[PDB]
Design an enzyme around this catalytic site. Structure first.
Site, PDB file in Angstrom:
ATOM      1  N   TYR A  12       0.748  -1.245   0.000  1.00 24.77           N
ATOM      2  CA  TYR A  12       0.000   0.000   0.000  1.00 24.77           C
ATOM      3  C   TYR A  12       0.781   1.301   0.000  1.00 24.77           C
ATOM      4  CZ  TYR A  12      -4.036  -2.988   0.369  1.00 24.77           C
ATOM      5  OH  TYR A  12      -4.980  -3.943   0.051  1.00 24.77           O
ATOM      6  N   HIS A  36      -4.073   4.874   5.527  1.00 22.11           N
ATOM      7  CA  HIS A  36      -3.840   6.172   4.908  1.00 22.11           C
ATOM      8  C   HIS A  36      -4.626   6.278   3.596  1.00 22.11           C
ATOM      9  CE1 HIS A  36      -1.250   9.306   2.813  1.00 22.11           C
ATOM     10  NE2 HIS A  36      -1.662   9.905   3.916  1.00 22.11           N
ATOM     11  N   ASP A  37      -4.717   5.171   2.863  1.00 21.98           N
ATOM     12  CA  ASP A  37      -5.465   5.153   1.608  1.00 21.98           C
ATOM     13  C   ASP A  37      -6.944   5.260   1.907  1.00 21.98           C
ATOM     14  OD1 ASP A  37      -3.357   4.947  -0.120  1.00 21.98           O
ATOM     15  OD2 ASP A  37      -3.460   2.747  -0.279  1.00 21.98           O
ATOM     16  N   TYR A  61      -7.873   8.823   2.796  1.00 20.85           N
ATOM     17  CA  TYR A  61      -7.994   9.604   1.565  1.00 20.85           C
ATOM     18  C   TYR A  61      -9.266   9.147   0.843  1.00 20.85           C
ATOM     19  CZ  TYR A  61      -3.310  11.762   1.414  1.00 20.85           C
ATOM     20  OH  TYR A  61      -2.199  12.529   1.653  1.00 20.85           O
ATOM     21  N   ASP A  88      -2.697  12.615   6.968  1.00 23.52           N
ATOM     22  CA  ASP A  88      -1.246  12.536   6.873  1.00 23.52           C
ATOM     23  C   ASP A  88      -0.600  12.442   8.258  1.00 23.52           C
ATOM     24  OD1 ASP A  88      -1.641  12.724   4.163  1.00 23.52           O
ATOM     25  OD2 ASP A  88      -1.110  14.843   4.025  1.00 23.52           O
ATOM     26  N   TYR A  92      -1.885  22.280   1.850  1.00 24.31           N
ATOM     27  CA  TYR A  92      -2.373  22.832   3.105  1.00 24.31           C
ATOM     28  C   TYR A  92      -1.192  23.242   3.971  1.00 24.31           C
ATOM     29  CZ  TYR A  92      -1.031  18.205   4.891  1.00 24.31           C
ATOM     30  OH  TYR A  92      -0.323  17.067   5.199  1.00 24.31           O
ATOM     31  N   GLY A 113       2.665   3.022  -1.849  1.00 28.78           N
ATOM     32  CA  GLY A 113       2.978   3.252  -3.227  1.00 28.78           C
ATOM     33  C   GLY A 113       1.668   3.725  -3.790  1.00 28.78           C
ATOM     34  N   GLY A 117      -1.042   2.139  -6.002  1.00 33.63           N
ATOM     35  CA  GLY A 117      -2.282   1.352  -5.916  1.00 33.63           C
ATOM     36  C   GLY A 117      -2.373   0.629  -4.591  1.00 33.63           C
TER      37      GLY A 117
END
Length: 121
Positions: free
Chosen positions: A27, A47-48, A51, A89, A64, A29, A31
């Site tokens: 993960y 984290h994915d 998002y 993040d 930001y 990276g 995809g």
């Protein structure tokens, strides 16, 4: 933006996001499929998902601001999109830092073919 997030990682782990976490596991990276290889990889998985839960934003591109209050990470008052992107993040970078003790060199440059079966957020 990979910029602010990159700085967060370098500050919390002391490592450069590129390439210490840019080719890591399934993960961290691009995809991402299959079972995360370890805790650090799970960090990127979460984290994915974080998002993924910001359909109304541009987590990767949009930028930001943020700062640090005597130690910890502190997200600034921006647009909710930027406020949330920042929180996604911050959680990952702190996740990385938290699990540095299990960071494995063998998970860098991980070939995605070894990542099979889409896990759900």
């Amino acid at each position: 933006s990979l910029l602010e997030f990159g700085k967060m990682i370098l500050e919390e782990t002391g490592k450069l996001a590129i390439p210490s976490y840019s080719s890591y596991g399934c993960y961290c990276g691009w995809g991402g499929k299959g079972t995360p290889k370890d805790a650090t990889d799970r960090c990127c998985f979460v984290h994915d998902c974080c998002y993924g839960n910001l359909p109304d934003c541009n987590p990767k591109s949009d930028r930001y601001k943020y700062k640090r209050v005597n130690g910890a990470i502190v997200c600034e008052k921006g647009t909710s999109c930027e406020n949330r992107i920042c929180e996604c993040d911050k959680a990952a970078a702190i996740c990385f830092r938290q699990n540095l003790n299990t960071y494995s060199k063998k998970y860098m440059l991980y070939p995605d073919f070894l990542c099979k079966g889409e896990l759900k957020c």
